[PDB]
Amino acid sequence: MKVGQDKVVTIRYTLQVEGEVLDQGELSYLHGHRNLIPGLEEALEGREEGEAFQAHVPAEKAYGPHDPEGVQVVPLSAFPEDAEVVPGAQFYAQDMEGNPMPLTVVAVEGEEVTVDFNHPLAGKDLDFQVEVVKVREATPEELLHGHAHPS
């Protein structure tokens, strides 16, 4: 059948950003309930079961723009222990009032250590290769729960 609202869709995908493959796998999702990034859903909407295709998803319809205000230099002492002074390092530091914001080292040149509280894909455009494996109708529980079940 055709991918549409309230259908439980199983896709196998390859995610590539600016050249390299950052992710790849297979998942199931309830279509129409904001379970996927907007861009991605729009591209799947209408697709036939089995249909394969590619999709360019702008940061705007994915994980959003990069907020440079999200970058910041912090003292090594900020982290009272022994960890990493290298990029890629991600921490889940707490927000000044609530609802923590995971950060990521952007560099380390001595004491001046850069960090990023933006999504690791913020500011990036995503290029997907998709394959609609299974497309079934959602069950009452799924609809109530708002998510697809391993079933």
C-alpha span between 60 and 64 (Å, rounded): 5
Domain total in the chain = 1
| Cα 93 to Cα 3: distance, rounded to the nearest angstrom | 39
Asked if 9 and 132 touch (Cβ cutoff 8 Å), the reply is yes
Return binding residues. 16, 33, 35, 49, 52, 77, 112, 137, 145, 147, 149
Full domain range(s) for residue 60: 1-151
Positions at the binding site for Zn(2+): 35, 49, 137, 145, 147, 149
CATH number where 63 lies:
3.10.50.40
Residue 10, judged by CB atoms within 10 A of its CB (0-12, 13-18, 19+), counts as middle
Give the residue numbers of the binding site for Mg(2+): 77, 112
**Which residue type sits at 111?**
E
Looking up tokens 């279509």, which residue turns up? 31
d(CA 120, CA 22): 11
The sign of the dihedral angle between the CA atoms of 21, 26, 28, 31 is: positive
The binding site for Ca(2+) consists of 16, 33, 35, 49, 52
| Tokens encoding 92 | 């889940």
Resolution (A): 2.7
3-class DSSP assignment, residue 128:
strand
CB 45 within 8 A of CB 38: no
**Cα-based torsion angle of the residue sequence 54, 56, 60, 65 in order, rounded to the nearest 10 degrees:** 120
Contact predicate 55/127, CB 8 Å: yes
DSSP per-residue letters across 36-105: S-HHHHHHHTTPBTT-EEEEEE-GGGTT----GGGEEEE-GGGS-S----STT-EE----SSSS---EEE
Question: How far apart are the C-alpha atoms of 135 and 46, rounded to whole Å?
Answer: 11
Could you tell me the sign of the dihedral formed by the alpha carbons of 41, 45, 49, 51, in that order?
A: negative
Rounded to whole angstroms, the Cα distance separating 66 from 134 reads: 34
Which uninterrupted H or E stretch holds 21?
strand 20-30
User: Counting beta carbons within 10 angstroms of the beta carbon of residue 61, is it exposed (0 to 12), middle (13 to 18) or buried (19 or more)?
Assistant: middle
Q: Which amino acid is at 134?
A: K
Number of Cβ atoms within 10 Å of the Cβ of 21: 11
